[model samples]
Target: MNYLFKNGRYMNEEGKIVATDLLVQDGKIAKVAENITADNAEVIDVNGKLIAPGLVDVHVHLREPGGEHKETIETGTLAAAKGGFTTICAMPNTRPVPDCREHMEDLQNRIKEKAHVNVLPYGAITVRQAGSEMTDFETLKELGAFAFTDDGVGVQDASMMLAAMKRAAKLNMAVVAHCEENTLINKGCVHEGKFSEKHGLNGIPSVCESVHIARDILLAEAADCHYHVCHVSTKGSVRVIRDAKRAGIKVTAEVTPHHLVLCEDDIPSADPNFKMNPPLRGKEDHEALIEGLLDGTIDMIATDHAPHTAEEKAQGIERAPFGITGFETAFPLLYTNLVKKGIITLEQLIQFLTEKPADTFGLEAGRLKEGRTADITIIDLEQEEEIDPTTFLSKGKNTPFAGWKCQGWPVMTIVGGKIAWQKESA
Candidate 1:
């Protein structure tokens, strides 16, 4: 396949935005220069757009092999492509809890057939994610599981987690953990702050997450396994990870947009749209998360794009489940808030969304270099639009940023040298 993208400004090898044209051939970047000429090339005009490597998300719930009504492989991958993501690692807490070789292969087959973007499935550390018995990590790794985790629920047993970490180390897989101390969450729905008090609802304390972070980091250090903390939401937890990094511990962490941007003080009436596991914390934690990202304590920025149906979300925060739809707005949100605010440069922010996650997870994507797969995202930084969750491509219509003005929207996305998503004229 031969295609030409003309008049676009891309971050070159020097991390400087330079105007150039690109020629993609055979699913790789064949040429990148100021001008390119090709006969019979499928032409695309990207003037006034920024061409960056497609995003890579390590913490996304496709809700497939189970919650199809909420999200499917097709719907989830489409959402990813539209969001300028070429790859998304699926969480393991599906209906069947992908713990065995057969389940992992089944998920891979579905991805190959229906997914427009690359799909990497994770295997559960415990069978059925019940946190009681350990799963066969060796077999699942051989069958192509990216990593091991019991997401959506924390493993309460420290001994079991330690054993799993040891096994994961032997298998050379990173143990991605959902950190939460059970004692801190008795029936909480939001953060333990004014929002929960005003709404007369229980709140999940920051200690719930920090305690687990402290425990897991120690265990991972003892077991000699690479440990990754998912969707970190508290200042105490950030402190723990920061200290671990300073001590030369093999730990990496990710922070979600809600955790980095929103706070409990910003909550309104315990809305389910704002409900998320490890619920958004106070302003102090939010500021710390930003600081962690800038200081390299937080390795990457992930959406944790957990999806829920409107019927479920409409039940109110106390009764509704925890999650938010984030795949479509990740880049736009961060670009506007972090990059536009001058807290981080565009190169630094894009690196977190792209190269950093790919390097940590060992995925062969998230770079603009030649010979890499032609996974590219063309973004219009000047474009401004209102976020309408109803216009989302994903089956789940749960979003906390609904109706908010967001800039830097994706105009075109190409995956494997083929156009995956483009804004259509109504």
Candidate 2:
């Protein structure tokens, strides 16, 4: 179905909003001009809402082919569409990991059958993600792996990571690292800070993240591969990445909305909803992440949209699994906490959500221009609503922001010139 979005202020390449009407036809934007009218297309009056390129997330866990009790490709992608994302990269930490061509192709078939939005699957960096031996990067890449990653577990062996980076560089594939040193983890669940000190809980030290980042940045430089870090949650990691960028390493990092907005102090209770890998850090780290984002040390914002079963998540902070459902709440929380609070400009926030990830991953998305694919997100920045996880489209309703009021809800999400998700009122 073709759509004519009327009176919408679309974002331009210069990060400026320009008032225009967009005509989407045959799965591509046909025109972007003033007073566009189409005889057969359905015209929807946006009424001056912000129309931008669809948000692209490069780090998400759509647990399919296993762990469907937590989430599936269908529900996860639907949640992504509802949250204004048209393209999302799925992590390779499933039951049967996507390390081999057969497993990768099986997961791809599931995505083709179930996903409501574009789902790009990552091939595991090591066999079974065991970190013992590397997977065949060339074969997996041939089978349509978006990138290589062993998310949920960082590669511990320095030589193994170096070998993987060298092989990935030869394949011209991006090596996305989770960036956590297992030796430093110490089975800790929360950040090492005042909260953990006060509660007498074992803390996950910041070096657990930064040490791996520091090591991988050098390996990526030595191997000369496109290296990307996932869920950077520490000040030291940000500093290291910033320095690496200054020294001209082909390294990019992504910060999650949870890491950007929430701190270790925000944990009101020992709830599993607040539990995540590379757990929330101190306010100093939060501020550093914001600074990294503004200064381009952080390349993009990705909701490591991990979901776990309520039963699993209800296992308490110590035993419960790490992660929370984030696809539906990420943009709202970031817009409210970051943009509305004057921490970042709206244009910059949109770029971080849309264009930056697309550019970093070399995806053909993150722009609202004529002749581009009509993957658009229409947001109602003035509409205020309280976050209620029970009403979320995702199967996992395990968010910490349960009652927080926020604006900038996505009212209409268009994918490939079709209405993938539309608010009932809109």
Candidate 3:
């Protein structure tokens, strides 16, 4: 597993690329400087490719235990490695939901047995995420749960959420919310916008997400809790979070890659790949999300790497589950759409994917400095490629970006000084 990464280019702290060499030994970064010689190390000549810290993601669905038909720990982590993510946080929306000690232990065991990269899992805020009964947060945190969330469903009652936030604050575990009001959702699916009106379909209002966020911000303030918002897709949510942060409330939020790059107006048809919860909103909402990231209202970019079978996704817009496969395409899509187009800088994008999530959620990952764990990703920044779901390592092929041309794809990924995934030569 020892390596001397030679002739690599990396982004310095100044946000500029510089020639460098990295030495990896004993599962740690031995050295990183202008030039280093390791006689006994396996030399990996990156040939001027970009070498950076492995990406970090806070919201992803591995779907093990009961929903392995969608994705497993092995498949999901493999997908993460291929996508250059060395550390990813799994959500608490699985079959058994990881509410109790027994289920939590089972999940930890599975991750240990199967994961290819670091997998930190979250425990459900409510037992089975029924939105009524709160989970044993203390026991789950003791069992190594990264955070507490009811991701697929939001905590509905204000009183219940206040209690949950109070409990989470006491335990020092963050309260991560999905932020949907069931009354606003009301059997709706896509964004409540022109698309739904044109197609005569039910649309999920933007307030369905923002209203819950507004309520939780207050509850979080009351409890003195660190509240993290998930998959933020609306301007109203962004405005509320901005006000709360300005008022000095403890809050952080994450926006998904899909929501940043696409909107409901871009949906070609009823194809379920275009569907997801807190669904792709209007042009103004999309613009606001990008602005939010630039202004620091959104703390990080998460994949929310939801997976579903082709059979399940093909069940039409109304019946199909809410989500799209995110891990494999996340970086490439953002790099192409945001960075290459001058919407965001490459350095800012890297920081969002690497440093911000780790700092926000207190995860033990991110940064590309010497003496750290060798969680690294090598990117072929000049290689042009098309968005092909058929080439994805993830089991889910539910992406809407098929056939789009892109560059800046990850060519190799290393985890703990071991080669985790590398692209094959054409």
Candidate 4:
């Protein structure tokens, strides 16, 4: 279907907003100019809306091939579309765990059949993600795995990680590390901060993340591989990454919205909704993450869009799974808390959500320029509404921001020139 998004404000190459009409045809951007007219195409008025490149998320858990009770590619991509994302990378912590060529092909087939947006599956760093045996990196890459990772668990052995990095370097693939030391974890669930101390709960130490990040950075530097850190949550980890970049190490990292907006002090109750791995740290860590994002120490914002059944999540903070559904709430929360607060400009925020992740992951759908793929999102920046997880397209409605009133909601999403998701009444 052809579409003409009329009279939308879009940022140009010079980072200035320009009023223009975007024409989509044959799954590509046909034109971006003033007053474009396509008599044969469907015309949609986009007055007072911002048309930008669709968001690209580098880390999301779809829980397919098993655990469909939690999420599937179809429902997860639907959530992605609602959140203004045209592409998302699925973590390899699924049941069979995309480790071998057969597993990768199975996942690729499922994505082809069910994904609403482009879903790139990650290949596990180890077979079945056991972390004791390395997977066939070359074959997995050839089978269209986006990158390699053992996302839910970190690769604990330094020698094993070094070997994996070397293989990834030779194959020109990125090694995305979860960055946690299992020995230091000690079965702690929440952050090792004020909340845990006051509640008398076992805490997850900051060094659990920082120690692994520090180790992997050196291994990546020695192997000279492209290494990406997942969900950085510690000030120590930020400082380590900052120094690594200064020393010319090829390292990139992502921060989640929860980590940037909330801290351990913000934990209202012992509800499991606040529970997550590398759990929300202290005020200092939150502030440092914001500073890192501002100064370019952090590359982009990823949802880490993990999901779980209500029963599973109801297991309480001590036993509940470590994750929260993020695709539906990320933009509004960040827009209200970050951009509206004057911490970062709208342009920089858009870059972090769109262009930066695309560039990092080598994706093709992050720009709204002419001749690019017609993957675009139109957002209503003036639309203020409370977040209601009940309305989410994702099966997992487990976000902590249940009633937070916010602005900047996605009104329409277009993928490859087709209407993927649109607000019903709009």
- Superposition TM-score, candidate 1 onto the true structure: 0.98
Candidate 4 Cα RMSD after full superposition onto the native fold (Å): 0.9
> What TM-score fits each model?
0.98, 0.98, 0.98, 0.99
Q: List all candidate RMSDs to the true structure.
A: 1.2, 1.0, 1.0, 0.9
Query: Which window of 10 residues has the lowest lDDT sum in candidate 3?
Result: 361-370
lDDT, model 2, position 371: 89
Put down candidate 4 lDDT per residue, 1-426, tens digits, no spaces: 788889888888878888888899998999989899899988889996999888999999998989898988899999999999999999999889999988899899999998999888899999989989999998998999899999999998899999999999999999999999999997798998899899989999999999999999999999999999999999999999999999999999999999989999899988888998879999999999999998899999999998888888888788888999999898989999999999998888899999899898787777878899989999999979999988999988888899999999998888888889999987
Tell me the tens digit of each residue's lDDT in model 3 across 171-271: 88799999988888868989888999999999888888999999999999999999999989999999999999999999999999999999988999999
Off by over 4 Å in 3: none
Candidate 1 lDDT by residue in tens digits, 1-426: 899989999878888899998889998988888878997898888876898888899999999889999999999999999999998899998887788877888888888999999888888999999889999988998888889999988999999999999999988889999998888897999998877777788889999999999999999999999999999988999999999999999999999877877998888665799898989778999999989998999999989999999999989688899999999888888888778989889898788889999999888788888788899989989878888988999987898888888788888888999889998741
lDDT of each: 0.89, 0.90, 0.91, 0.91
lDDT by residue (1-426, candidate 2, tens digit) is: 788989988677676788888899899989988889788988889998888889999999888878888888899999999999999999999989999988988899999898899988999999999999889998999999999999999999999999999999999889999988888887798998898898888899999999999999999999999999999988899999999999999999999999998999899979999999889999999999998988999988999998888788878798988898889998889889988999988998898988789888888898877888999999998989999998899989988999999999999898898888989875
Arranged by lDDT with the best first, the candidates are 4, 3, 2, 1
- Candidate 3 residue 359 Cα shift, in angstroms, is 0.6
* Error at 266, model 4, angstroms: 0.5
User: In model 4, which residue pairs have backbone atoms overlapping below 3 Å?
Assistant: none
Q: Tell me model 3's lDDT, rounded to 2 decimals.
A: 0.91
lDDT score, candidate 1: 0.89
